[PDB]
Design a protein around this ligand. Structure first.
Ligand code: A1EY2
Length: 137
């Protein structure tokens, strides 16, 4: 296995009625037709789970590009940093953001995520969709 293995994305939202997560260890192609759901206006964090198997790694970064119809791409880069090898997964969390709000803000956002580093290595790249709704259901 590679030294760095990205295993999971979770949306951390205390107001959500259940877990919001995606296993990143398998068929990433299937994520493109799927979606995860946030109630409009919800406060959330993106949490990336990853393993460091053998060697200290440095310069890790999480890059997230969000696409919404009629809008230019919303690009955000988050410094993840340096991690040593250990059996248990690490979790990196972004700062809190607020999900969009408004009937016209609802619906699909297409995300492209990169777990990478200062040397531009592709630890994992994946697409996933977010659906913003008036209510959780
Ligand atoms: N600002 C919005 C935006 C909407 C949703 C998210 C998002 C991403 C991942 C998880 C939860 C929410 C980020 C930004 C825009 C995106 C593109 C054009 S406008």
């Amino acid at each position: 296995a590679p030294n760095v293995v990205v295993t999971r994305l979770t949306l951390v939202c205390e107001s959500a009625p259940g877990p919001i997560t995606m296993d990143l260890t398998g068929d990433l192609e299937a994520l493109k037709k799927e979606t995860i759901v946030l109630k409009e206006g919800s406060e959330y964090r993106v949490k990336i789970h990853f393993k460091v198997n053998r060697d200290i790694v440095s310069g890790l970064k999480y890059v997230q590009h969000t696409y919404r119809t009629g809008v230019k791409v919303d690009k955000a880069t988050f410094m993840v940093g340096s991690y040593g090898p250990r059996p248990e997964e690490y979790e990196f969390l972004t700062p809190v953001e607020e999900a969009p709000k408004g009937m016209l803000a609802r619906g699909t956002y297409h995300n492209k995520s990169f777990f990478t580093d200062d040397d531009k290595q592709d630890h994992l790249s994946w697409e996933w969709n977010l659906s913003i709704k008036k209510e959780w259901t």
